């Protein structure tokens, strides 16, 4: 699962 948005966005 991805619990991290787009870094720097």
Coordinates of C-alpha atoms in Angstrom, one line a residue:
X1 CA 0.0 0.0 0.0
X2 CA 1.1 3.6 -0.8
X3 CA 0.6 5.9 2.2
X4 CA 2.8 8.7 0.8
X5 CA 1.8 11.3 -1.7
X6 CA 4.1 12.7 -4.5
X7 CA 7.2 14.2 -2.8
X8 CA 7.5 17.8 -3.9
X9 CA 4.0 17.9 -5.2

